[PDB]
């Protein structure tokens, strides 16, 4: 409903985090960007609070479990497909 979909790719050097958090809800499972650390990697790459996460590493949100999420979010690179409102 008036949103735009786009891809984000982030890499971490060699040991900080991506600087964001995600929230879940029950098309069954849906992932939203909960917070974005003002001075974090995700923020710099254009991730915004309230964005919906459609895919991580090419896998749909509803197909991701906690183990996969934890693994993917801790890897040295991360791909996201996100739906966001233009500013």
């Amino acid at each position: 409903m008036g949103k735009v979909t786009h891809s984000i790719h982030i890499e971490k050097s060699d040991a900080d985090t991506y600087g964001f958090s995600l929230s879940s809800v029950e098309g069954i499972r849906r992932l939203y960007v909960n917070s974005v650390k003002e001075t974090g990697l995700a923020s710099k790459k254009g991730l915004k609070a309230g964005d919906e996460i459609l895919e991580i590493n090419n896998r749909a949100a509803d197909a991701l479990n906690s183990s996969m999420l934890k693994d993917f979010l801790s890897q040295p690179s991360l791909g996201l497909l996100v739906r966001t409102y233009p500013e």
Binding site: T17, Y18, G19, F20, S21, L22, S23, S24, V25, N34, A42, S66, L69, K70, L73, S74, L78
Partner: peptide
């Protein structure tokens, strides 16, 4: 609902 930190 659960929060995950990256």
């Amino acid at each position: 609902r659960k929060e995950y930190y990256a």
